[PDB]
């Protein structure tokens, strides 16, 4: 591939420049090259990989929502025809989005999930696997069922590790519980399980805040605050 002749350190350096330039496609491609060198990613390098692909798929998801909304309005009751163009362009965007999700899931399966022994990296990657299957599920309808169970899971394996190996304020553990709660509510038709998970995660974190320094307190409490925001929306 096009990154094969570049040094790993130069790929990471260039991912950081691409982030500063808000060139997230380039950022992702440089991070994918770095993962293909076959060395474990550091904490900082896992965050670069995540930010890169989150921004790429973010843009795709937003555009797919816009086009899907136009498409449903055109298929509405009492409407004139416009030909196949809105369906075709929605499909084009959807295929591009599936492609990026399959890229990410391939990287996780082929390179990243379990060369990780430490809980921080194992949980981070399984959460990411859940997330990208969740984005495939947002556009699926089957086959939707199989994708939903894949997301559940991953989240469930991440959850089991996080509860055994991490404290209840750990930011990765809190972020995982936030996203799995969103999966229950948005994807899995399980609002009661979403609400129970956000509540218990919030309460167990609040009880252990007293153990944290100022800066760790801020890291954990910002995610607890998102949990509370979801609880307030849902209840």
């Amino acid at each position: 591939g096009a990154m094969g002749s570049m040094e790993r350190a130069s790929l990471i350096q260039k991912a950081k420049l691409a982030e500063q330039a808000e060139r997230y496609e380039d950022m992702a491609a440089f991070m994918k090259g770095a993962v293909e060198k076959g060395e474990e990613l550091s904490c900082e390098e896992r965050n670069l990989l995540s930010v890169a692909y989150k921004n790429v798929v973010g843009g795709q998801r937003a555009a797919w929502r816009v086009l899907s909304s136009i498409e449903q309005k055109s298929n509405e009751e009492g409407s004139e025809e416009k030909g196949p163009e809105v369906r075709e362009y929605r499909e084009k965007v959807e295929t591009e989005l599936q492609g990026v999700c399959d890229t990410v899931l391939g990287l996780l399966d082929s390179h990243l999930i379990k060369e990780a022994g430490d809980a921080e990296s194992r949980v981070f990657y399984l959460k990411m696997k859940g997330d990208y299957y969740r984005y495939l599920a947002e556009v699926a309808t089957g086959d939707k069922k199989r994708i939903i169970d894949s997301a559940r899971s991953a989240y469930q394996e991440a959850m089991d590790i996080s509860k055994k190996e991490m404290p209840p304020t750990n930011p990765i553990r809190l972020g995982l519980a936030l996203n799995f709660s969103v999966f229950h509510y948005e994807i899995a038709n399980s609002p009661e399980e979403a609400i129970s998970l956000a509540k218990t995660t919030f309460d167990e974190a609040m009880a252990d805040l007293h153990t944290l320094s100022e800066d760790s307190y801020k890291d954990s409490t910002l995610i607890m605050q998102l949990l509370r925001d979801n609880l307030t929306l849902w209840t």
Binding site: L178, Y185, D229
Partner: peptide, 7 residues
């Protein structure tokens, strides 16, 4: 509709 982790 419900927001996920932004970081």
């Amino acid at each position: 509709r419900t927001p996920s982790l932004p970081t």
